[PDB]
Design a protein around this ligand. Structure first.
Ligand code: HEM
Ligand code: CL
Ligand code: CL
Ligand code: CL
Ligand code: CL
Ligand code: CL
Ligand code: CL
Length: 384
């Protein structure tokens, strides 16, 4: 039996400079590590089993908000409700379904790179990574392109206020404006359904309600955009400091795919998944009572050294690339195929117009830690 609970202060983890060092510090503390109210499960055997066991490791108990909120479709649901949502949404998010959008997404990506390439410099987060996901979101779901500025502003306000009592007056107005904006859209799509996703999920044999589509739309905006922003930054960072990799990847979709898998493996934008247990569980000989809040450490598992595909290094070769940067079990990222499509498009079109570039002088990449983001703070790039 394990009766001595390791405890760490989250804010002291050495995470700003090198995530490998940060996750190793946590993993080496033990299979179960208590930090700031949560039990972190750090080892592959436990993390993957837990992700794969929604009955025991509940998402709803960890993620259902208080009050009477918009339903967080499907993130905050357990089976059987979760299973229905995933069955309904799966066909719209498959590689084959999303591949049909590629000409449009490529055209918009090319235009975004076009405006940057002539400058010889940029700060890649503010100037591209922060803007690109919402741009493609408007394209994918048929929203007015001129609404990008205010939609990004609403998203940023809602994300920043989520973890914080005492909401600022500006914060509540932004949340209300976003809700009103999305509500009008969803109602129009129910009355006049086009061939698009948000229309089609509201009709057919098992239609979603307007409130369900509103909750889904909110979730896609809050969970599906900044995650890709973070991955764009890490993609361009690693390319900026690896000239021969840049050369190899230009016009090389097969290897760009491999590179993107490595970026998501090594710098997963959501490196832990929260759950609450529904019955006693024993992890590493330690028994946790029912109702225990746990955080499952996917990013640590991806780096645990247990095979050649799980090291702290960027590994471009090897016949197999696999990881849990998109999660695992039934909640595995609904948008994983979209994220891959968008990231590979971005890298390819960036290298087509900006094949050679470098970090600005005396720049040392860091994330803000602790914070609500595992993205780079900034990324100053130079070329020409
Ligand atoms: C590199 C980019 C991304 C990463 C690293 C990422 C990561 C993740 C992870 C780890 C989860 C599982 C959370 C959990 O188990 O509690 C998840 C779920 C989800 N993601 Fe992503 N994601 C990315 C992009 C996207 C995109 C582009 C979309 C859609 C536009 C999206 C939509 C969702 C949704 C709807 C869920 C909930 C699925 C469910 O609960 O069944 N994500 N994501
Ligand atoms: Cl909910
Ligand atoms: Cl300029
Ligand atoms: Cl797997
Ligand atoms: Cl490409
Ligand atoms: Cl500078
Ligand atoms: Cl900062």
């Amino acid at each position: 039996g394990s009766f001595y609970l390791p405890r760490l202060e989250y804010s002291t983890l050495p995470m700003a400079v090198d995530r490998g060092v940060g996750w190793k510090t946590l993993r080496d503390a033990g299979p179960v590590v208590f930090m700031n109210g949560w039990y972190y499960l750090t080892r592959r055997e436990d993390v993957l089993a837990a992700l794969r066991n929604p009955k025991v490791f509940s998402s709803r108990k960890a993620l259902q908000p208080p009050g009477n909120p918009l339903p967080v479709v499907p993130l905050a649901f357990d089976p059987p409700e979760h299973t229905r949502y995933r069955r309904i949404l799966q066909p719209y998010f498959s590689p084959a379904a999303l591949s049909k959008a590629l000409p449009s997404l490529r055209r918009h990506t090319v235009a975004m790179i076009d405006a940057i390439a002539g400058r010889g410099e940029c700060e890649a987060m503010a100037d591209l990574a922060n803007l690109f996901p919402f741009q493609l979101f408007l394209v994918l779901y048929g929203l007015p392109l001129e609404d990008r500025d205010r939609l990004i502003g609403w998203k940023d306000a809602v994300i920043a206020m989520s973890d914080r009592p005492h909401p600022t007056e500006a914060d509540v107005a932004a949340a209300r404006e976003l809700l009103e904006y999305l509500t009008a859209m969803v109602a129009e799509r129910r009355r006049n359904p086009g061939p698009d996703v948000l229309s089609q999920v509201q009709i057919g044999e098992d239609p979603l309600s307007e409130i369900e589509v509103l909750g889904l739309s909110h979730l896609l905006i809050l969970a599906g955009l900044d995650t890709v922003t973070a991955a764009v930054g890490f993609s361009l960072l690693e390319l900026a400091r690896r000239p021969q990799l840049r050369a190899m990847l230009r016009d090389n979709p097969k290897q760009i795919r491999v590179f993107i898998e490595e970026i998501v493996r090594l710098e997963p934008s959501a490196p832990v998944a929260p759950r609450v247990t529904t019955e006693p569980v024993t992890v590493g000989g330690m028994t946790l009572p029912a109702g225990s809040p746990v955080r499952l450490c996917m990013a640590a598992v991806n780096r645990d050294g247990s095979d050649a595909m799980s090291t702290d290094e960027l590994v471009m070769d090897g016949k197999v690339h696999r990881h849990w940067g998109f999660g695992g079990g039934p909640h595995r990222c609904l948008g994983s195929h979209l994220a891959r499509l968008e990231l590979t498009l971005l890298v390819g079109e960036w290298l087509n117009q900006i094949p050679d570039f470098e970090l600005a002088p005396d720049y040392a990449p860091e994330i803000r830690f602790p914070s609500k983001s595992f993205a780079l703070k900034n990324l100053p790039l130079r070329w020409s």
